[PDB]
Design a protein around this ligand. Structure first.
Ligand SMILES: Cc1cc2nc3c(=O)[nH]c(=O)nc-3n(C[C@H](O)[C@H](O)[C@H](O)COP(=O)(O)OP(=O)(O)OC[C@H]3O[C@@H](n4cnc5c(N)ncnc54)[C@H](O)[C@@H]3O)c2cc1C
Ligand SMILES: Cc1cc2nc3c(=O)[nH]c(=O)nc-3n(C[C@H](O)[C@H](O)[C@H](O)COP(=O)(O)OP(=O)(O)OC[C@H]3O[C@@H](n4cnc5c(N)ncnc54)[C@H](O)[C@@H]3O)c2cc1C
Ligand SMILES: CCCCCCCCCCCCO[C@@H]1O[C@H](CO)[C@@H](O[C@H]2O[C@H](CO)[C@@H](O)[C@H](O)[C@H]2O)[C@H](O)[C@H]1O
Ligand SMILES: CCCCCCCCCCCCO[C@@H]1O[C@H](CO)[C@@H](O[C@H]2O[C@H](CO)[C@@H](O)[C@H](O)[C@H]2O)[C@H](O)[C@H]1O
Ligand SMILES: CCCCCCCCCCC1=C(C)C(=O)C(OC)=C(OC)C1=O
Ligand SMILES: CCCCCCCCCCC1=C(C)C(=O)C(OC)=C(OC)C1=O
Ligand SMILES: [S]
Ligand SMILES: [S]
Ligand SMILES: [S]
Ligand SMILES: [S]
Lengths: 421, 421
């Protein structure tokens, strides 16, 4: 309302949860902040692969949101938004109730586009997913069914995927867990299928010696790897795969039996956001400027996986570049700053800064990680790391981020200054 | 003097040059800042290996100091200090003139301890050095003599060395340059000799896969490598090397003929500083507290290679851990802050922060670099990088640091925030 603007944050994930706290800290008691989310709990997404192999449980990586945001004066609605009317500035919830906003910050993450590959939905066949804790639990249940009745394994990433690290991580920890259980020798075949033009491309044209290291890692585990692949369908417990050459021409088709499978799907924008006229590209991603502001609606901002970022290359099989946590938090920080600036008679000038990708993977006792910036080469930083210390750093960061999601954030967010003293 | 304290910075190197500018910026026109240095020019030390193979010249990496510091109100004395009387607070210069100080910041870098190995002084025999531009020029002259009359090459690091990267870099670029000149096949033997307990230890117990990468790099260049070595003498154009086992017992002695040689020497404190009673350890390094303040004299501070840092391990052949640029600048920044604090009735609380080591090496088209922190394992960051981008980053940083040494510094110093936007 006038003089007391209502800011709604849609989606309580890696971007949206911090966005809610930061928005309320920034605006104070004179304004209303409402966080709306499909789930009543927060989950630490990067730990889902471990849930998928039974190395972690839901309770380790997830917690109920309400009390933590409410104690900060933030309203919480645990309902999915089904429609957004950008003209009237009304959000229609799954229960049919309506929420009006003065500013909207979209942080809705990805729609997991299983529809791209008929039969690939985790509920339709043997190809599972570890992108959410619900799905990771389902993946682990199927993994146990595999242990009871061993059969072919296929892990990888679909055409159009932008999130490749977790596929490699999952393959490695499944292989590891099999060995632990003395079951590895009972698997007839273990295959890695990816849309990447080469192993370790990771949607970022490689980082450090990711190609050499991941290539050798898969080989060492007896995992046969295929690149430039797209899955045309999953049917009768078989994955139908087409492999192309540099020019997109078929060099082979394969039919792979699958007892246990996990393929990272392509991401699209969620339906309620994609459905807003003029807001998004054909993929459903919000078209925003450098200030995280929608190009169509001046009072809609967006951050996280939900925003559109232009491609920098065109791979033989479509692939996308990942949108990772540090860049996401930079988007959130900028959006919050610029909304506040708007509420104070200014055009905020803050941007997300330089494009970058960062990621951790934990194989158990040791981890891998990378940092790449900016997007195109030659880069200013292009590094891949491996070792026990990376495992320890992942453990530490998870513990930290979860505590911060409970205690609240406000500051820029980062402890780079704390560990450098 | 009273109400107008005189601060003297001794040594105009990586630490001292910035220290002079930062001190004057911090104190302003009410105080006097004098920079005293043995040479009338600044040199960018990390580029010396390239001067040593003729890939760079003195004029590329060095420039006269006077005008740049004087235009900032800093007094410049291009004389070596020969004696320091800490009681009277008087510095005796090489010309016999005396300079009084109220505060002294020692930034005198290393004494190159060739005396540890009889015959190893660059002027005494074929074993040269690339630690200074004077010496690197001499190394290149001898390298040309090698080209005229090919013979055995021996490159490496002496017992007690703490600076290992440049030995590997130099070996690699000499091998590279030989190939360029079609002379590589004319070298009867090319040997790498190091006090490190293993290749790629680097005085920091390894970083990333430094061991594997440097091991393979030397092998690829046909360079035979020996670890756990100390040179007992250089004589009649032969290097007498003793190799020990884990327990320091001789497993062999070797006598290596040398036509062209380069061994990084051990570092000690410079004589004028080491000669100050109670100031230093037996090695000549200033014993300081966390605030960079001498433990003996409250008005003497120290930064850079000149300070004592306790060892964290005891290798079969003595080795030391490197003191590198980012940590050095942190020492400088803290010293300046705490001297100013003293001049304003306070004990400055600023410290150099977390121990870390960083380094670049440039092989021509591609570079290597590492970051390790803190000193003991498991680390919070332990990374090794290689590629064209590292070459480009080294070129950029050199260009930047040299310009900053001409234009002046004041700020914390760093552009991490500039390239992240
Ligand atoms: C398996 C996996 C591993 C990853 N590993 C890393 C890593 O190591 N490092 C890294 O930096 N990044 C990693 N990422 C990438 C990225 O950081 C995460 O995907 C991150 O969670 C994305 O944040 P987000 O805020 O954009 O979306 P999300 O965290 O997915 O949050 C979206 C939120 O919006 C909600 N929502 C969706 N639709 C609606 C609706 N219509 N109405 C209301 N709410 C809705 C969702 O329930 C969810 O709470 C990983 C990603 C995955 C999937
Ligand atoms: C070959 C080489 C390569 C290196 N590579 C890297 C790298 O890649 N990355 C990195 O971060 N670090 C690197 N270092 C390590 C370190 O950063 C440098 O040695 C750095 O120059 C040390 O800074 P300093 O200020 O302590 O000493 P210096 O830079 O050596 O400065 C000491 C100054 O004191 C003067 N001085 C000495 N005695 C007296 C006296 N009695 N009276 C007056 N003045 C005196 C000297 O002339 C000199 O100007 C490298 C070192 C060397 C030798
Ligand atoms: C972060 C997301 C992107 C990637 C996700 C998943 C990656 C899976 C990791 C597979 C790699 C396993 O293979 C592993 O790699 C490194 C090689 O560089 C080796 O380790 C080697 O380098 C490391 C440091 O980096 C040294 O500490 C070690 O002594 C050395 O042998 C391991 O001996 C090898 O077993
Ligand atoms: C910084 C100071 C400390 C070290 C100083 C001097 C180091 C000398 C460098 C010798 C290494 C040369 O060997 C080189 O190493 C890397 C392997 O990791 C290889 O490069 C490999 O990893 C890089 C990324 O890191 C990839 O871009 C490349 O595609 C891959 O092949 C090169 O193919 C090999 O030729
Ligand atoms: C320098 C080499 C590795 C050490 C990096 C330490 C800190 C970076 C952690 C990466 C990370 C960031 C930044 C991050 O913002 C984030 O989102 C919350 C993650 O999880 C999804 C991350 O894993
Ligand atoms: C993250 C991987 C590598 C990129 C690092 C970029 C900036 C760091 C440069 C290293 C360096 C620092 C910090 C430094 O302070 C310094 O002294 C002036 C150097 O020269 C001696 C350096 O080479
Ligand atoms: S998923
Ligand atoms: S990734
Ligand atoms: S030297
Ligand atoms: S080094």
């Amino acid at each position: 309302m006038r003089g007391s603007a209502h800011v709604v944050i849609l989606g309580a994930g890696t971007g949206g949860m911090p966005a809610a706290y930061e928005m309320k800290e920034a605006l104070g008691s004179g304004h209303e902040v409402t966080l709306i989310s499909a789930n009543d709990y927060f989950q630490f997404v990067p730990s889902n692969p471990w849930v998928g192999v039974g190395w972690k449980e839901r309770d380790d990586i997830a917690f109920p949101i309400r009390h933590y945001v409410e104690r900060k004066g933030i309203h919480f609605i645990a309902q999915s938004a089904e429609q957004i009317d950008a003209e009237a500035q009304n959000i229609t919830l799954a229960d049919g109730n309506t929420v009006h906003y003065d500013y909207l910050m979209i942080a809705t993450g990805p729609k997991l586009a299983f529809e791209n590959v008929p039969g690939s939905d985790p509920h339709e066949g043997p190809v599972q997913s570890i992108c959410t804790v619900d799905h990771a639990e389902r993946a682990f249940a199927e993994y146990q069914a595999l242990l009871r009745e061993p059969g072919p394994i296929v892990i990888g990433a679909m055409a159009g995927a932008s999130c490749f690290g977790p596929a490699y991580e999952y393959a490695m920890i499944v292989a590891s867990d099999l060995k632990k259980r003395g079951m590895r020798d009972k698997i007839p075949s273990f295959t890695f299928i990816t849309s990447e033009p080469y192993i370790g491309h990771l949607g970022i044209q490689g980082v450090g010696d990711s190609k050499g290291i991941l290539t050798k890692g898969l080989k060492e585990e007896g995992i046969e790897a295929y690149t430039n692949c797209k899955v045309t369908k999953v049917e009768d417990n078989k994955m139908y795969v087409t492999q192309v050459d540099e020019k997109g021409e078929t060099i082979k088709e394969m039919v792979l039996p699958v007892k246990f499978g996990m393929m990272i799907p392509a991401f699209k924008g969620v339906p309620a956001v994609a459905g807003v006229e003029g807001l998004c590209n054909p993929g459903g991603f919000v078209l925003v400027d450098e200030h995280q502001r929608s190009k169509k609606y001046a009072n809609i901002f967006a951050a996280g996986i939900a925003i559109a970022i232009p491609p920098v290359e065109t791979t033989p099989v479509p692939t996308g570049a990942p949108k990772t946590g540090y860049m996401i938090e930079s988007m959130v920080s900028a959006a919050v700053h610029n909304i506040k600036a708007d509420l104070e008679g200014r055009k905020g000038e803050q941007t997300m800064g330089t494009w970058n990708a960062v990621a951790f993977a934990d194989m158990g006792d040791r981890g891998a990680a990378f940092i790449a910036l900016p997007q195109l080469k030659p880069r200013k930083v292009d590094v891949f790391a491996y070792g026990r210390w990376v495992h320890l750093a992942k453990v530490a960061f998870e513990k930290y981020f979860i505590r911060k999601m409970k205690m609240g954030v406000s500051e820029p967010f980062y402890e780079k200054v704390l560990f450098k003293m």
